[model samples]
Target: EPFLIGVSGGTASGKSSVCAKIVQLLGQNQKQVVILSQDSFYRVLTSEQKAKALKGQFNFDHPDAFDNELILKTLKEITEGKTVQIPVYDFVSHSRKEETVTVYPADVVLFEGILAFYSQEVRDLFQMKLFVDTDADTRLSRRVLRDISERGRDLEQILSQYITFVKPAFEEFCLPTKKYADVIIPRGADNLVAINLIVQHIQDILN
Candidate 1:
C-alpha cells in the first residue's frame, strides 16, 4: 500500500511550504508524491451561504468548512491506485475555481491543511502526521501578508477574520489535533531537523 502523510498546522503556519519541500525531496526517490489539500474540498455554497461567506463570520478553520467525506474517499482511491479529480479552491473569491486537478496514484501522498487530523477517519489514513507548531502571532502576520498580496483581502477584513475565525478555530480545533501527530516542530518551515527527518521517512517508505 502507498504511504500517506498528513501535514497540519494553524493558518499561515507554512504547511504548504513544508509540503512543497517534502515533495521536492521525495522526487529523487523511487516513490512518486501526490498532494491532496483540504482547501480543494471546500463545500459549494448557495447564494445565502456565499453572502455569509463574504462576511468575516465564516468559520473556515472549523470542522464543517471542509468536505471530509470527499477527502476520505479520494485518499482511499489514490492510495489504492485509482485516479481522482481534486477540486481547486479559490481563497480570493471564497469559492471553488472552475478548474479541477486530476491526481493519479503515488508512492507518497502529502496531505496538508489546518483540520486534516480533525476526524478519526482522516487521522487513520495517515502513516506520518506532522504538526507545524509555529507561534500564533507569526502565523497571523504571515497570513496577513499572503492573503493581502494574492488572496485578495484588505487589512481590516483580514484582522477581523483572524480575530473572529482564525484564532478561535486554532484554539478549539487545530491545536487539539496536535495530540494525533507523530512529530511536532516549533517553527513549521524553519525546522530543518523535522523536515529532513520527514524526507528520510518518505524515502524509506518509497524504497
Candidate 2:
C-alpha cells in the first residue's frame, strides 16, 4: 500500500521546501510521489470578496479559508486508490479557477499545508505526520523575501499581512497542532538527521 505523510507548519515555515526535499529524495528511488497542497482547496470566494483580495486585504491565514470538506474527500479518494481531480486555486484572485489537476494513485502521498492537521478526519489518513518547526523570526524573514521576489509585494503589505493575520493564525491553530506531530523537524530540510530518518523509514516501507 502507498504510504501517506502529513506535513504541517506555519506560513513561511519551510513546509513546502521540506516537502520538496522529501519528494525529491523519494522520487530518486523511482517511487511514485504525489503531493497535495492545502492551498489548492481554498474556498471559492465570491465576486465581492475578490475585490478585497485584489487590494491585499483578504485573510487567508485562517482554517475557514480552506474548503475542508473538499480536502477531506480528495485525500480519502486518493488513499483508497481512486483517481481524483484536485482544484486549482489562484492566489492572485483568491478563488478557485476552472482548471483542475488529475491525480492518480501513487506509492507515496505527501499532504502539506499550514493547517494540514486541522481536520481530524484528514489527520486519520496519515501513516506518518511531520511538523516543520521553523522559528518565527526565520519564518518572517523567509516570508518577506518570498513575497517580495515571487508575489511582487512590498515590505509594507508583507509585514502587515504577517503581523495582522499570519502570526495570529500560527499561534491559534498551527502551533497547537505541533503536539499532534509524530516527528518534528526543528530546522526544516536542513535537519538532515530528521530528514534521513524519515527517508529511511519510507524506503523500508516500500521494501
Candidate 3:
C-alpha cells in the first residue's frame, strides 16, 4: 500500500515547498514520491459561476468549490495501488481541461490543499497528517505576488478577495482542522528541523 500524507495549510503557506523538500530529501527514493494537489479537483463551474469567478466574486476558498467525491475516489484508488487519471483545472478559465494527469501508485503520496482536511472521509485516507503553519502576513505577501504574477489578478482584486473570502474561510474552515493533524509545522518548509524529523520518521517506516 502507498503511504498517503495529507498536507493542509492556508493559501501560500508553503505546502508545495514542504512536499518538494520532502521529495528532495528522499534522494534515491524521490522518484517514488507523488505530489497530488487538491487544486486539481476543483469542480467545473456553471456559466454563472464562471462569470462570478471572472469578477472575483466566487468564494473559491469554500469547501463546496471542490469535488470532494472525486478526490476521495482518486485517493482510494491510489491507496489500492491503482494508477489513475486526475483532472486538470484551469484557474483562469475556472473550469477543468479535457486533459488529465496520469498518476502512478508510489511509495509516498503527498496530497495538499488549503482545505485538504475538510472532509472526514478524505482525512481518514492519510497515514500521516501535516499542517503547515505560517504567519498570516507571510501568506498574504506570497499570495499577492503569486496572484499578480501567475493568475493575472490585480492588487486591488487580490486584497479584496483575500479580505472577503480567503481570510474568513481560513479561520472558519482551514484553521479548525489543524487539531486533526499529527504534526503541525511552524514556518512551513523553512523549519528544517521539523522537516528533517519528519523525513527520518518516514525513512524509518519505509526501511
Candidate 4:
C-alpha cells in the first residue's frame, strides 16, 4: 500500500506549494509521489447554486460542500495501487469540468486542502497527518493575491467571501483538525527546515 499523507490547512496556507515541494524532494530519491487536492472533489453545483456562488452567497468552506464519498473511493483505490480518474473543478464557473485527471498508483500519496481531514472516512486512511499553521493575516494576504491573479476575483469578492465563510470555517472546521496531526508546521510553507525534515522522515519510511 502507498504511504498516504494528509495535509490540512486554511485557505492560502501555502498547502499547494508545500505539497509540490514534497513531491519534488521525494522524487529525487526515486520515490513515486502523487499529490491530490481536495478542491478537485467539490460537488458540482446546480444552476441556482452556481448563480448563488457567483454572487458570493455560497458557503464553500463548509464540510458539506465536498463529495466525501468520491474522495474516499479515490484515495482507497490509489492506496491499493489502482489508477483512478479524478474530477477537475473550475473555480470561475463553480462547476466541474467534463474532463478528469488520471492518477496512477504511487509509493506515496500526498493529499491536501482546507478541509482535507473533515471527512472521517478519508481522514482515517492517512498514515501521516500534517497541519500547516499560518497566521490569519498572512493567509488572507496570500489568498487575495492568488484569487486576484488566478481566479479573476477582485478585492471586494475576496474580502466578502473571506469574512462570510473562509475565516469562520477555518476556525470551526480546519483549526480543530490540528489536534489530529502528527506534525504541525508553523509559518506554513515559509518553514523550509520543517519541510526538509518531513521529506527526510518520508524517505526513511519508504526506505
Candidate 1 lands at a TM-score of: 0.93
Give the per-residue lDDT of model 2 (tens digit) for 129-187: 99998878888888888888877777987888888888988899889999889999998
Q: What is the lDDT of residue 75 in candidate 2?
A: 86
Better of 2 and 3 by lDDT: 3
lDDT of each residue in 92-155, candidate 1, tens digit only: 6778778888887777788998999998987898989999888878888888998898876689
Error of 2 at 36 (Å): 1.6
Model 2 TM-score, 2 decimals: 0.94
Q: What is candidate 4's lDDT per residue for 104-198, written digit by digit as tens? A: 88898899988888888888999999999888898888889989999877898889888999989889998998888888998887888999999
Provide the TM-score for each candidate, comma-separated.
Answer: 0.93, 0.94, 0.97, 0.96
Task: List the global CA lDDT of all models.
Answer: 0.84, 0.87, 0.93, 0.89
| Backbone Cα, N, C clashes tallied per candidate | 0, 0, 0, 0
Candidate 4: clashing pairs of residues: none
C-alpha RMSD of candidate 4: 1.2
Stretches of model 3 off by over 4 angstroms after superposition? 28-31
Model 2, stretches more than 4 Å misplaced?
none
